[PDB]
Design a protein around this ligand. Structure first.
Ligand SMILES: O=C(O)CCC(=O)C(=O)O
Ligand code: NI
Lengths: 10, 68, 329
């Protein structure tokens, strides 16, 4: 559950 | 004295209008910046001076922002 | 899904010509200055681009070892266009499973492998290095401090969006979308091929896009059928593709493929970049799918411009000293 960013997806 | 592309001059104007108009809680002024208001002011000045940029002398083949 | 993909792949009705087919040596900064990077570009070979890639027979198992067996990977479930997660060891198993025994269609488009062994194996086009905001605007000492190779936001020192590995199986489909923050994209087809649909970011089109996203009922509508002009086009192995800011695109995977690519903002189409960010704001895109530290990057961009031109800095003393130390390297 560490938050992420920069995740490619529609 | 330096010549920017209209592409850049327009975008930097949009940039500054956007950033200055955001409330404090969405402004996201990062750690490195000293005085955000002084930066905005300086950008607007700069933009006036560069308004008269020659479009063909701007085509230098190297970006204006580059590390020393 | 409610529409028929086989037909979207078959029709000639997507006949617009948006792409400039180009020589690698011609894609330089002057080209950028004069055209504003407004057009999708295709390089049918790598010559004069500046790219480096891995061994031609690099496999997904080799990717797994460079990044780690236990690394968690975002995987798209193609039939829902929703995200799940697994480890790279599990992804590898799935990818290596023969085509008929694969129960579901799954796609990986979001493995960012900076700060792993893989990263030195991939180089992006020289020109992108010259204009990428991350390289050219973000304080360098922060960028260089990055140790974490996953995309965990709390460990992120800079926008970690530069180097993606994409691993897609035959039959994969990614629905119409604009890339985060209106980033531009460079995509190199290492093995296999891809089919793209491209829709131009006109005001009208971007309004249809936003409305489509707000509708929810999206597996229903093939957005390429709603616009005046759409180009479908096939990339083959060895091609390098560049998508400009704001371009609406969807991608199908006809054979098992491996792509290396990356995203970047730049100073020549800021207004489109801002336009896309605010579509994301309005349609409530969660943070994880957005460009990290976007406004932060924008502030640093302004500071760089003022400094490089007028030599007045608006960085803290500490930050100037850090910058000075790296100039001395
Ligand atoms: O290649 C794919 O499956 C989708 C690529 C893409 O457009 C993305 O990652 O945003
Ligand atoms: Ni994309």
């Amino acid at each position: 559950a560490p938050a992420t960013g920069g995740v490619k997806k529609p | 004295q330096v010549h920017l592309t209209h592409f850049e001059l327009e975008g930097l104007r949009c940039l500054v209008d956007k950033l200055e108009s955001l409330p404090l809680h969405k402004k996201c002024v990062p750690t490195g910046i000293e005085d955000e208001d002084a930066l905005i002011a300086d950008v607007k000045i700069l933009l006036e001076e560069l308004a008269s940029s020659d479009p063909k002398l701007a085509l230098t083949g190297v970006p204006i922002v580059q590390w020393p | 899904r409610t529409f028929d993909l086989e037909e979207k792949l078959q029709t000639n009705k997507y006949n617009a010509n948006f792409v400039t087919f180009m020589e690698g040596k011609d894609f330089n900064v002057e080209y950028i200055q004069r055209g504003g990077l407004r057009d999708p570009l295709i390089f049918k070979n790598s010559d004069g681009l500046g790219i480096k890639m891995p061994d031609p027979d690099f496999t997904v198992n080799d990717v797994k070892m460079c990044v780690g067996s236990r690394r968690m990977v975002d995987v798209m479930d193609v039939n829902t266009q929703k995200g799940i997660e697994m480890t790279m060891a599990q992804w590898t198993r799935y990818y290596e499973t023969p085509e008929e025994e694969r129960e579901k269609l799954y796609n990986v488009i979001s493995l960012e492998f900076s700060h792993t062994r893989l990263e030195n194996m991939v180089q992006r086009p020289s020109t992108v290095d010259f204009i990428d905001w991350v390289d050219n605007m973000w304080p360098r000492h922060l960028k260089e401090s990055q140790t974490e190779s996953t995309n965990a936001i709390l460990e992120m020192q800079y926008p970690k969006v530069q180097k993606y590995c994409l691993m897609s199986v035959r039959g994969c489909y990614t629905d119409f979308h604009v890339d985060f923050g209106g980033t531009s994209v460079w995509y190199h087809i290492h093995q296999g091929g891809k089919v793209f649909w491209l829709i131009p970011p006109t005001a009208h089109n971007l309004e249809l896009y936003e409305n489509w996203l707000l509708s929810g009922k999206q597996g229903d509508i093939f957005l390429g059928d709603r616009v005046s002009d759409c180009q479908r086009i096939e990339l083959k192995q060895g091609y390098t593709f560049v998508i400009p800011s704001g371009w609406i695109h969807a991608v199908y995977t006809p054979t098992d493929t491996l792509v290396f690519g990356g995203n970047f903002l730049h100073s020549f189409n800021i207004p489109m970049q801002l336009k896309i960010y605010s579509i994301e704001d309005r349609t409530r895109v969660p943070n994880k799918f957005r460009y990290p530290f976007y406004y932060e990057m924008c502030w640093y961009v302004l500071e760089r411009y003022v400094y490089c031109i007028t030599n007045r800095s608006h960085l803290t003393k500490d930050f100037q000293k850090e910058s000075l130390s790296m100039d001395m390297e």
